[PDB]
């Protein structure tokens, strides 16, 4: 694709077609990428500003028996440093059925937990590799 956007060593694809969380991830994997992780304030800002107020699936999903949040691209999840990135009151596990996460609010406090079977646009991430 020519639509990939560049920021700090990584390329990002903002989809034009909505998919479920896992179908989105599979699309990313077919393009040599994963649903995006978020590992700094600057990256969170780039993503929510680029999202322009629309909801995008990101790589947030539950893992292990505790149900701690994790990144599908296998970036270790930093719970301490990620607290600042959830919309206040989230993750709220509405209906006991919200096991995936998206960028929802256009703010540094952007993330929401939503049902994985919901269809949203999505964001892939790919490190530049020469
Ligand atoms: Ca929620
Ligand atoms: Mg697309």
Instruction: Kindly list the domain boundaries of the chain, sorted by start residue.
Output: 1-130
CA–CA separation, 1 and 125 (whole Å): 13
The method of structure determination was X-ray
Ligand 2 centroid – CA 17 distance (Å) = 4
**Residues linked to residue 68 through DSSP beta bridges, in sequence order:** 63
Ligand 2 centroid – CA 72 distance (Å) = 19
Pick the CATH number of 1-130 from 3.10.100.10, 3.30.565.10, 3.30.230.10, 3.10.450.50: 3.10.100.10
CA–CA separation, 125 and 123 (whole Å): 7
Q: Residue 91: nearest ligand to its CA?
A: 1
Give this entry's resolution in angstroms: 1.5
CA–CA separation, 6 and 3 (whole Å): 10
* Residue 5 neighbours by CB under 8 Å, 6+ apart: 11, 12, 13, 14, 50
Token reading at 126: 């790919």
* Residue 94 neighbours by CB under 8 Å, 6+ apart: 113
Ligand 2 centroid – CA 62 distance (Å) = 24
Instruction: Say if residue 108 is preceded by a cis peptide, omega within 30 of 0.
Output: no
Q: What is the dihedral of CA 42, 25, 19, 2, to 10 degrees?
A: 60
């Amino acid at each position: 694709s020519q639509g990939w956007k560049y920021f700090k060593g990584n390329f990002y694809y903002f989809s034009l077609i909505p998919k479920t969380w896992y179908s989105a991830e599979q699309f990313c994997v077919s393009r040599n990428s994963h649903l995006t992780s978020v590992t700094s304030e600057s990256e969170q800002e780039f993503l929510y500003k680029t999202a322009g107020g629309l909801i995008y699936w990101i790589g947030l999903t539950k893992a292990g028996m505790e149900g701690d949040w994790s990144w599908v691209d296998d970036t270790p999840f930093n719970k301490v440093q990620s607290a600042r990135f959830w919309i206040p009151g989230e993750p709220n596990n509405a209906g006991n059925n919200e096991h995936c996460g998206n960028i929802k609010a256009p703010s540094l406090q952007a993330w929401n937990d939503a049902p994985c079977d919901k269809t949203f646009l999505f964001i892939c991430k790919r490190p530049y590799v020469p």
